[PDB]
Design a binder for this molecule. Structure first.
Ligand SMILES: O=C(N[C@@H](O)C(=O)O)c1ccccc1
Ligand SMILES: [Ca+2]
Ligand SMILES: [Hg+2]
Ligand SMILES: [Hg+2]
Length: 329
């Protein structure tokens, strides 16, 4: 054959019934070791105009925590709910990732905290990072923290401290502050090592890298995991104004962008990139329902991709595929 757009295409898996789930705002997705989908959602709680004040202190405390199960593990085939937890803990759930031991790492924008959770415990968090409901910028505080990444080989814990800070903080396995890097993207053009809302983390296990979705700058920044050296910047006109979430599997970087402003050419979409060259090789969207705020993305080596939306309260399963002739060319 000839013409050379990529033969790789991501399509919604239509026989997955998880799209019919009615959670709250889906803020986080992850895969466990048995390849189940794990979602983190806000139940009846919404991040809205009344949630915070000028100084980033949560305003709906008298309403209490989310009283329903906030973390659900979902079957990859029939989408049945295998387990649930996280009841009466969280206020505005944000990030979720799972380490190699199977612990849930979780982030709360209202509490300004990060939690490590044993999924089989009925005793509560193993570790809590941050000060309850208290925003800050020093070693013991967060300011609307957004994501967590935990390196399998060292145990090092990385937290993107994002919506009101511009840093990535490293912690010990025991939760001691080790180091930190990043600053606000300065006036004129944003420069290497400067974030405007670090919003999502992807580890690259065997290339010693840590990628950050730089939300308000519409770019992805990659750093050496040990020396914090800026490695590379990924930015495309197709992204538009925002990059909400990234996820890595060997060979690929998956990303998800923001909903366009009135006037913008670039639709909301999922992106597949060749990890080496950085180039977009495919662009995709669901058949059922629609993207509004696709908010987190995870991919598996088996070629499965999951995306959760924070405005349409939906999670979708897609599969990566290479066809001799892309469905419909
Ligand atoms: O996009 C926002 N929130 C989402 O990421 C979310 O729902 O988590 C946001 C909007 C206004 C102010 C601050 C944050
Ligand atoms: Ca995640
Ligand atoms: Hg081809
Ligand atoms: Hg967010």
């Amino acid at each position: 054959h000839h013409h050379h757009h990529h033969d790789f295409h991501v399509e919604e898996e239509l026989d997955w019934p998880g799209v019919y789930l009615l959670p709250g705002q889906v803020s986080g997705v992850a895969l466990d070791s048995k390849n189940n989908l794990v979602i983190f959602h806000r139940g009846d709680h919404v991040w809205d105009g009344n949630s915070f004040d000028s100084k980033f202190v949560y305003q709906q405390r008298g309403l209490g925590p989310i009283e329903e199960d906030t973390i659900l593990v979902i079957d990859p085939n029939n989408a049945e709910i295998l387990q649930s937890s996280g009841k009466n803990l969280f206020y505005l759930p944000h990030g979720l990732s799972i380490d190699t031991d199977g612990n849930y790492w979780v982030t709360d924008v209202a509490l300004h905290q990060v939690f490590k959770l044993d999924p089989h415990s009925k005793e509560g968090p193993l570790l809590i990072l941050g000060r309850s409901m208290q925003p800050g910028s020093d070693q013991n505080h967060f300011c609307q923290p957004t994501d967590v990444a935990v390196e399998p080989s060292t145990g090092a814990v990385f937290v993107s401290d994002g919506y009101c800070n511009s840093r990535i903080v490293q912690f010990s396995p025991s939760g001691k502050f080790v180091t930190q890097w990043g600053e606000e993207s300065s006036g004129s053009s944003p420069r290497p090592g400067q974030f405007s809302v670090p919003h999502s983390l992807a580890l690259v296990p065997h290339l010693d890298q840590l990628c950050v979705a730089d939300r308000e700058n519409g770019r992805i920044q990659c750093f050496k995991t040990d020396t914090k050296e800026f490695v590379r910047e990924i930015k495309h006109a197709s992204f538009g104004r925002n990059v909400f979430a990234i996820s890595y599997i060997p060979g690929f970087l998956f990303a998800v962008n923001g909903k366009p402003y009135f006037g913008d050419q670039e639709p909301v979409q999922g992106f597949v990139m060749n990890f080496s060259s950085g180039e977009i090789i495919d662009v995709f969207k669901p058949v059922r329902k629609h993207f509004d705020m696709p908010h987190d993305i995870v991919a598996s080596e088996d070629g499965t991709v999951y995306i959760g939306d924070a405005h349409t309260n939906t999670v979708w399963k897609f599969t990566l595929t290479e066809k001799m002739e892309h469905r419909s060319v």
